[PDB]
């Protein structure tokens, strides 16, 4: 009835607590993990994970990485992670829209560097709004 869930960033463990269920933003879709799952390795996109410790949900924005699940240990390695409780949903809607436009603008442009920069910002702002607002499809 228990998994231990750990999110590990390059400088520190960001999350470490028991959970009944975790939703992982894998590169091929949202993965749903319950207790006693067979061992698994997956890539993680920049997006939102969710953790249910008892009956409520907690969302965390993840900046890409991978996850292993083995013997009721879920270990998540990401370049960065932010608790959705920390993100102002109005602000994150604002930023997502702004990054959306800046990305559209870079794409009209000539500079591959700018396209990459703006894509990086766009993905980060997406994952932050998914985590603030809880809806994946935006």
């Amino acid at each position: 009835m228990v998994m231990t869930v750990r999110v590990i960033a390059p400088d520190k463990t960001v999350w470490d607590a028991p959970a009944e269920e975790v939703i992982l933003p894998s590169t091929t879709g949202q993965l749903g993990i319950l207790s006693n799952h067979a061992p698994l390795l997956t890539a993680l996109e920049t997006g939102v994970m969710r953790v249910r410790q008892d009956r409520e949900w907690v969302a965390i924005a993840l900046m890409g990485g991978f996850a292993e699940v083995e013997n009721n240990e879920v270990t998540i390695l990401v370049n960065g992670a932010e608790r959705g409780d920390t993100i102002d949903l109005e602000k994150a809607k604002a930023e997502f829209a702004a990054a959306q436009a800046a990305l559209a603008q870079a794409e009209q442009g000539e500079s591959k560097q700018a396209k990459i920069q703006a894509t990086q910002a766009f993905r980060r702002a997406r994952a932050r709004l998914q985590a603030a607002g809880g809806v994946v499809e935006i």
Binding site: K12, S26, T28, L41, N79
Partner: protein, 254 residues
Amino acid sequence: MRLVAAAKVAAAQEQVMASRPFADRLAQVLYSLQTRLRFEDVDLPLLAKRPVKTVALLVVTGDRGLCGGYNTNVIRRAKERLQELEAEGLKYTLVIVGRKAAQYFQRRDYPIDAVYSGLEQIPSASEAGQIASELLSLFLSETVDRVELIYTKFVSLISSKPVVQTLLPLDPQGLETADDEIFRLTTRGSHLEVNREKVTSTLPALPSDMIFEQDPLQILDALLPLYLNNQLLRALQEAAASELAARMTAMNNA
């Protein structure tokens, strides 16, 4: 005169310890990925080896200024590396940590892609990631063909010096060598010293029956940005350890 220098020694040593779980896990997954992929034959953007016509140089300095020739030595070695590249007919662009060093290079007409605040005493993984994203945007756009960095690092138990290393392309041989070297900082006398030890990875290999949700190549590709950020952050923690060493030196000379 205060003993709180040891407090920042211990806070730094804490962050360095806190970085180990990440590197241990990176290593564990890399090890198991090796049993499905020949790393040397992997073709992925962060491993691309283009004929090198342009180089990005990351220059790591601090903005707090009382550390002897800590910053001066970095700045001089970077100037020298850039002269070497120019002699070879290579183009370059600078990414500078430290605003005063950015100004030194600006006044001398060097090309500067990006500037960041001087190295902070306990370097953040978000600090590292902002720099890394910028180096990715130079390298993956093929604006440059190699990314080097220059930073100060302990090379003996007592002494540190600027070093010149390569960040991108990633090195397959680095991907196969696990995070072996861990280093502990310690104030001994009124000077600061580093000891480095080899550690056997504490955790086992991944189960044989483990499911790969995506093809191994795609999992490796998702890992490579983490490896990069681990390498960059480790260099920044080395640079900060060296700067604390230099700043203690400067204190006790007075």
